[PDB]
Amino acid sequence: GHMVSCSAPGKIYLFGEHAVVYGETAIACAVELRTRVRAELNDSITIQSQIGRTGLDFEKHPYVSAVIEKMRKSIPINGVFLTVDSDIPVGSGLGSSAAVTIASIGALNELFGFGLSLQEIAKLGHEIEIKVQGAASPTDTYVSTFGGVVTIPERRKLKTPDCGIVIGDTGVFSSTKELVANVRQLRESYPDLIEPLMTSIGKISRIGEQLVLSGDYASIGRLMNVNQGLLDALGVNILELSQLIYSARAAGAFGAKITGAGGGGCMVALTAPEKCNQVAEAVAGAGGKVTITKPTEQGLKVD
Amino acid sequence: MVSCSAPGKIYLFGEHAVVYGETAIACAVELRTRVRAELNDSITIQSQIGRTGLDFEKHPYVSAVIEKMRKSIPINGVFLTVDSDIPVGSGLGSSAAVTIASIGALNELFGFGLSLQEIAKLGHEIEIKVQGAASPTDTYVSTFGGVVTIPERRKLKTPDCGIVIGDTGVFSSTKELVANVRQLRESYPDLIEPLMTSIGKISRIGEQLVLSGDYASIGRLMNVNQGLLDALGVNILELSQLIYSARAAGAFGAKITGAGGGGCMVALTAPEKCNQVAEAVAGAGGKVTITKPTEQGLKVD
Ligand SMILES: C[C@@](O)(CCOP(=O)(O)O)CC(=O)O
Ligand SMILES: C[C@@](O)(CCOP(=O)(O)O)CC(=O)O
């Protein structure tokens, strides 16, 4: 008869977004922007977050409701009160939906003693995102479960960079599905042109793998800038993203690029700790909601 | 008193990749350099820069044109008055245009009898003497006009579109920009060289789109080309702001034209949306020049 709190981090793409869906490598990096889910025993099912208080509700709380629906089939959950707080803004490729999924599983696993392992939690989180989105990659829930720097799809763990991470949100809503659809149709229109560009994005991630293992942050940011041009060439860049990205580079960032589907949302700037604040001021001065964070090895943890 | 004009040009696709044996598509625009040539007591060359004599410093291309040509038919009193609406830099062909417009103006009065052929060979050999070394592409496109592929040098039909050139006002050294791309290519050759091939592939596809008049596909291939150049590091904030403002205003496509690092962008518009696009580029802070493609190179005005 008590309460339990769990948190799971978000992530940013160092390299390789959009190209993964065509079988190329990418490098995801968990950051210290987390979603907390606090769980208590209750008479009925209640979920409260930024967008209000609901019961079981697949319109407002689809991921948390799906988690409850699934896990109640092994150990029955007749009542629970879940409170969701997050530093990960819904939108862009920061993994907010995967963070709340993993944290909801972790809290319930602790509250009702499901005894699930971290591997089982990541596998369950992937299935939750499939039943909510129709089809989902296991990448988001895996990185939010284990933290750190993970390559996709090999799941190679790399050394977490001793770096600052500046996230500039353009405020435009990043609708992932249509941007992935826009890239696919561009790929279909010019196959011999776009498909090699997908090979080049994968080539960047494989080169960047050693640079992440070597700690060469200046080379990493340089390759991030090359990755940004290819993402721009694929059509997922916008004026606001370009303005935040170039403002961050001018203020001394190693590199800056879109993170996620693009077409709005957030960019990411890898900066040395000494340059975080002035990079954050430049992105803000360019009209961007700035978040100063850093990578993390901590995935799902019990608060 | 005669007057001749030669046009500038813009790159539809392929800049920066031509050095590494790739294809490019230049398109002459209706921005021309017109020089008045008449008879005078001394060889006087006037411009917006000023009125001088035979000055190989303030008038490098015009004065060198005088020297190479007078060795066949001696000239001693000409009043050259260059006038141009071609912005300086960004490979817009300002130096190439002022060259052939001078050669054609002297070929008129003093009767040199040069072909259109010869006005291109001499117009390129003179750029070899002025800036030490130069490519004949900038020169030829100013002589014939229209859409010209490089290096295959095939002429294509002119797209019935508008051209919005947006100057950022930022200076950039093309020598440094080419060398920077060169260093990046040698730092990651297995990565950057395929990007050079992709640019050339855009030019090959774009050739069929220029022939078919698929202006919308040309524009979206321009947007792809722009991302590749941005990946090579030749893009800046000001260029990106002008490019995306043109796209949001309805242009078929927008991209850097020339070396990048500043300088000018270019936007392909439907003829009706040409002013709407130009207003957005100016509203984004660009020095706008409204123009359109031309099929005529050097003409005796
Ligand atoms: C759009 C995509 O390329 C990256 C964005 O990831 P997310 O859906 O924002 O978590 C998805 C993928 O790579 O599979
Ligand atoms: C980038 C580039 O295509 C720009 C050409 O402009 P210009 O007419 O040479 O000034 C030159 C190059 O191919 O390196």
Minimum CA distance residue for ligand 2 atom 11: B16
Domain span at residue A108? 1-163+293-303
Asked if residue A18 and residue A137 are part of one domain, the reply reads yes
CA distance A204 to A193: 17
Q: For position A47, which CATH number holds?
A: 3.30.230.10
In residues, how long is chain B?
Answer: 301
Question: In this structure, are residues A92 and A80 in contact, taking their beta carbons and an 8 Å threshold?
Answer: no
B96 marked as binding residue: yes
Number of neighbouring beta carbons within 10 Å of residue B88 = 12
Contacts of A273 (CB under 8 A, 6+ apart): A163, A164
Question: Cis (ω within 30 of 0) for the bond into A153?
Answer: yes
Q: Is B203 exposed, middle or buried (0-12, 13-18, 19+ CB in 10 A)?
A: buried
Question: In this structure, are residues B80 and B46 in contact, taking their beta carbons and an 8 Å threshold?
Answer: yes
Asked if residue B144 and residue B89 are part of one domain, the reply reads yes
CA distance B61 to B103: 10
Asked if residue A15 and residue A156 are part of one domain, the reply reads yes
CA distance A215 to A219: 9
Q: Hey, are the CB atoms on B231 and A235 less than 8 Å from each other? A: no
Asked if residue B145 and residue B178 are part of one domain, the reply reads no
Q: Hey, are the CB atoms on B191 and A197 less than 8 Å from each other? A: no
Q: Hey, are the CB atoms on B191 and A199 less than 8 Å from each other? A: no
Cα dihedral value A80, A86, A92, A97, nearest 10: -20
Asked if residue B201 and residue B111 are part of one domain, the reply reads no
Q: Is B87 exposed, middle or buried (0-12, 13-18, 19+ CB in 10 A)?
A: middle
The pairs formed by B232-235 with CB atoms below 8 angstroms and a separation of 24 or more are B232/A226, B232/A229, B232/B16, B232/B181, B232/B184, B232/B192, B232/B195, B233/A225, B233/A226, B233/A229, B233/B180, B233/B181, B233/B184, B234/B16, B234/B177, B234/B180, B234/B181, B234/B259, B234/B260, B234/B261, B235/A229, B235/B260
Strands B79-84 and B44-46: parallel
Q: For position A181, which CATH number holds?
A: 3.30.70.890
Q: Is B191 on the interface with A (CB under 8 A)?
A: yes
Residue B127: CB within 6 Å of ligand 2?
Answer: no
Strands B253-256 and B155-156: unpaired
Q: Hey, are the CB atoms on A233 and B235 less than 8 Å from each other? A: no
* Token duo for residue B48: 């917006």
Question: In this structure, are residues B287 and B165 in contact, taking their beta carbons and an 8 Å threshold?
Answer: no
Method of structure determination: X-ray
Minimum CA distance residue for ligand 2 atom 3: B15
Q: Which ligand is nearest to the CA of A236?
A: 1
The residues of A that are catalytic are: 140
3-class secondary structure per residue, chain A: CCEEEEEEEEEEEEECCCCHHHCCCEEEEEEEEEEEEEEEECCCEEEEECCEEECCCCCCCHHHHHHHHHHCCCCCCCCEEEEEEECCCCCCCCCHHHHHHHHHHHHHHHHCCCCCCHHHHHHHHHHHHHHHHCCCCCHHHHHHHHCCEEEECCCCEECCCCCEEEEEECCCCCCHHHHHHHHHHHHHHCHHHHHHHHHHHHHHHHHHHHHHHHCCHHHHHHHHHHHHHHHHHCCCCCHHHHHHHHHHHHCCCCEEEECCCCCCCEEEEEECHHHHHHHHHHHHHCCCEEEEECECCCCCEEC
b/e map of B224-260 (b: 16 or more CB within 10 Å)?
Answer: bbbbbbbbbbbbbbbbbbbbbbbbebebbbbbbbbbb
Residue A24: CB within 6 Å of ligand 1?
Answer: no
Cα dihedral value A210, A214, A216, A221, nearest 10: 40
Q: Which of A15, A182, A197 to mutate to test the interface with B (most CBs of B within 10 A)?
A: A197
Residue B174: CB within 6 Å of ligand 2?
Answer: yes
Contacts of B261 (CB under 8 A, 6+ apart): B170, B172, B173, B174, B176, B177, B234, B236
Centre of ligand 2 to C-alpha A54, Å, is: 61
**Number of separate domains in chain B:** 2
Nearest atom in ligand 2 to B260's CA: 1
Both ends of chain A: CA-CA distance in Å?
A: 17
Contacts of A2 (CB under 8 A, 6+ apart): A40, A41
Question: In this structure, are residues A158 and A213 in contact, taking their beta carbons and an 8 Å threshold?
Answer: yes
CA distance A253 to A270: 6
Asked if residue B154 and residue B38 are part of one domain, the reply reads yes
A153: distance to nearest CA of chain B, Å?
21
Asked if residue A173 and residue A131 are part of one domain, the reply reads no
Question: In this structure, are residues A32 and A9 in contact, taking their beta carbons and an 8 Å threshold?
Answer: yes
Question: In this structure, are residues B246 and B155 in contact, taking their beta carbons and an 8 Å threshold?
Answer: no
A135: distance to nearest CA of chain B, Å?
29
Q: Which ligand is nearest to the CA of A101?
A: 1
Query: What amino acid occupies position B149?
Result: T
CA distance A166 to A282: 10
* Token duo for residue B272: 């009706």
Asked if residue A231 and residue A134 are part of one domain, the reply reads no
* Token duo for residue A88: 């990960």
How many angstroms separate the most distant Cα atoms in chain A?
A: 62
Minimum CA distance residue for ligand 2 atom 9: B91
Asked if residue B187 and residue B76 are part of one domain, the reply reads no
Place of tokens 């500046």: A166
Asked if residue A152 and residue A203 are part of one domain, the reply reads no
Q: Hey, are the CB atoms on B230 and A234 less than 8 Å from each other? A: no
Q: Tell me the backbone φ, ψ of residue B64, rounded to 5 degrees.
A: -65, -35
- Report resolution in angstroms: 2.5
CA distance B35 to B39: 13
Asked if residue B192 and residue B150 are part of one domain, the reply reads no
Q: Which of A186, A230, A246 sits opposite B240 (nearest CB)?
A: A246
Asked if residue B85 and residue B133 are part of one domain, the reply reads yes
Residue B178: CB within 6 Å of ligand 2?
Answer: yes
Query: What amino acid occupies position A80?
Result: V
